[PDB]
A paper describes a structure:
Here we analyzed the endogenous regulation of anthraquinone (AQ) pigments, which give Photorhabdus species their characteristic orange-to-red coloration during exponential growth. , AQs are aromatic polyketides produced by a type II polyketide synthase system (PKS), which is rarely found in Gram-negative bacteria. After partial cyclization, the AntF-bound intermediate is further processed to a heptaketide by the unusual chain length shortening lyase [name]. , Spontaneous oxidation of precursor compounds results in the red pigment AQ-256, which exhibits a tricyclic structure. Metabolic and proteomic analyses following CA treatment show that CA inhibits [name], a key enzyme in the final step of AQ-256 biosynthesis.
In the [name]:CA complex, the catalytic triad remains perfectly aligned (region II), with the active site nucleophile Ser245 positioned just 3.4 Å from the styrene moiety of CA.
Numbering used by the authors:
A (entry chain A), B (entry chain A): 5 to 381
The structure:
């Protein structure tokens, strides 16, 4: 017998995704260990290496699901609350990597996201974070919403807190990548607001993603204005990937509600749909609940009028080699938006600059603090 | 330009070490991100792949040192205490992977361990852990010692706490792997005691490692008996790798001082020195401050008399494919020590079973709690 190991061929093929799978070293957000990746991939079938192929992501979903199941079994037999929660967190992370690039069975994908959300909701009662979970009603839409307070938060010991609203992108899960990002703000005694807009979080595959996500963000801003615990004059909006595109829309439409806005590798338009790499065509199709033939028209509608002014301070982090949001379009926006837009461009980074996420989230979190301080915090 | 990535050849070669480098997802202990591994290895020279070769580990030390330096630069310009500490933690992790398998410049290795310890000591004042740091005098030896209390610990709100003493192995660093393990006990409202015996932690390359480490453990037990905050009737000793060998010695010599002992992949004797794989010959030589020709005689001295009774409950986690502490010798000890020794053996795992460390540390931490409960906690 040889020790369980990942094939070199498979590690190479997955290089783009490894920084995403490991993501940020977090306190609360679910995260894989190296051995979870070995459990998922050590017996992955050989000769299955096409990231654009349906067959690759089916086997990926099956193998990551097995690892999630193993952690649920640990959770169910756990002898302590602390062990139970650590196992639920590990399960949630594994089920997310099972589902995030799997689009072929809508019911299975929704089921995996329900497993993740059940892991999160089960874990809240044991958390040392205060989580205020509710639905925000936006016309007929009941929007899952989480307002999370820093460790050791007591309303009577605090002035009203600054708050960062963070948006999902196309294929993130709220309590995985977005809670991971949110910890950089919770760590600075800021409240955070994370949410499942249409086509986001547990709504992915249920409702189409809303291009006008700023409508839903406006409803969060109204809740935060009404909450005595939150200083609504000290708000930030952060989005990642397609959520960064939402950040640019928020900057244009309701920017005056925000001290500052962070765009983690969104852009004002998407590369040609037909030529998108990996599984991105099926990812966009799934989120918009549309077929291949309808998607370029949606991309045409998504494209921003960059002549429309941005109404607050924007910080964009972008990779020169981004193959979804091309750097040329981001640099054009940076030039046109002038002194109100700061661009951190990494020369040899792909989409979301994930080799640099620890360093750039340090810089981003301190930049947000600085903008609150500039607004009299 | 292509995105910064690790060579497939290099990822393959390093497969044994990747689970060790990523280790445990921690709250306090320094830990790398995937992008730190990319920063270290993306420009690693081609055709340098011999894990037994001095030239491999020189380039490894140089490249990881660059990543550590980059995080010190972030720490030094950090705009907040929280950002400063996260950067110091990242630097410490990187400097540890720079040094842990580098033996060719004693002064450089000691310097890197001093950087790590400076990162740790600098971080303590900002920690929400109470760290009581002192020297324990053992004859002429001044032993660095850290007694760490759980998050939110107040003596007046608590009965005297159980305490887990955790030992380094040959090439671990106290505040990296051992603090990572310790968090599983801190998370259960137990105190932990971590320490630099002779040839351990900042003493590696200064004093030879003590075979009779139980002498130093006895001095910790005396301090814990004297500390009103600690229930000295509720003590555990845990060791990892060569520290697990120390755990077996503690079980034999002072086991009656412990409710239970955990052996993470130590054994009662080491495989033949001359045939050790990778850089293990130079690792053992460095820790014992001896040349190649003296080391088999030291291995002969290390070998336990397994007929000497173990005086408490022992839990061993071991890999069938361990190439340092052979499973046959561990199974012989398990049989001879009978009902007082429990063995968790993973069929396809190498030394320390690092593909399983999250799951087995859940099980181990609950087993320790159970042993304290059996002793009336
Ligand atoms: O939600 C998306 O569409 C993408 C999010 C994301 C999050 C982390 C890394 C890369 C992409
Ligand atoms: O200190 C040693 O000799 C080895 C320790 C260790 C720690 C973590 C993983 C593998 C080995
Ligand atoms: Na358990
Ligand atoms: Na308010
Ligand atoms: Na900073
Ligand atoms: Na005591």
């Amino acid at each position: 017998n040889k020790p369980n190991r990942i094939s070199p061929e498979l590690l190479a093929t997955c290089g783009y995704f490894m920084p995403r799978i490991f993501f940020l070293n977090s306190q609360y957000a679910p995260q894989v260990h190296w051995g979870d990746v070995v459990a998922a991939l050590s017996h992955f079938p050989a000769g299955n290496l096409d990231l654009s192929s349906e067959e690759f992501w089916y086997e990926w979903m099956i193998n990551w699901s097995k690892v999630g199941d193993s952690y649920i079994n640990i959770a169910n037999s756990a002898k302590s609350e602390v062990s139970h929660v650590r196992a639920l967190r590990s399960a949630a992370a594994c089920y997310h990597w099972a589902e995030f690039m799997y689009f072929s069975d809508r019911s299975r994908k929704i089921q995996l996201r329900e497993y993740i959300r059940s892991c999160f909701l089960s874990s809240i009662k044991y958390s040392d974070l205060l989580v205020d979970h509710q639905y925000i009603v936006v016309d007929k839409f009941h929007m899952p919403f989480f307002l999370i307070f820093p460790k050791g938060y007591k309303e009577e010991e605090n002035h009203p807190l600054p708050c960062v609203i963070l948006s999902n992108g196309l294929d993130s899960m709220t309590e995985i990548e977005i809670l991971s990002l949110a910890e950089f703000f919770l760590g600075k005694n800021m409240a955070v607001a994370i949410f499942d807009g249409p086509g986001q979080g547990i709504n992915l595959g249920k409702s189409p993603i809303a291009i006008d996500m700023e409508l839903y963000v406006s409803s969060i801003v109204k809740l935060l204005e009404d909450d005595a615990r939150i200083n609504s004059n000290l708000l930030c909006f952060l989005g990642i990937s397609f959520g960064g595109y939402f950040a640019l829309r928020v900057a244009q439409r309701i920017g005056d509600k925000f001290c500052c806005i962070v765009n983690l590798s969104g852009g004002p338009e998407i590369a040609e749909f037909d030529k998108l790499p990996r599984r991105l065509k099926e990812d966009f199709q799934f989120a918009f609940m549309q077929d291949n033939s309808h998607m370029q028209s949606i991309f045409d509608e998504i494209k921003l009028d960059i002549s429309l002014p941005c109404k607050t301070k924007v910080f964009t982090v972008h990779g020169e080699l981004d193959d979804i949001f091309q750097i040329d379009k981001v640099k054009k926006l940076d030039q046109l938006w002038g002194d109100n837009h700061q661009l951190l461009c990494y020369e040899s980074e792909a989409h979301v600059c994930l080799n640099k996420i620890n360093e750039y989230m340090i810089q981003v979190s301190d930049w947000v603090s600085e903008q609150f301080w500039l607004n009299g915090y």
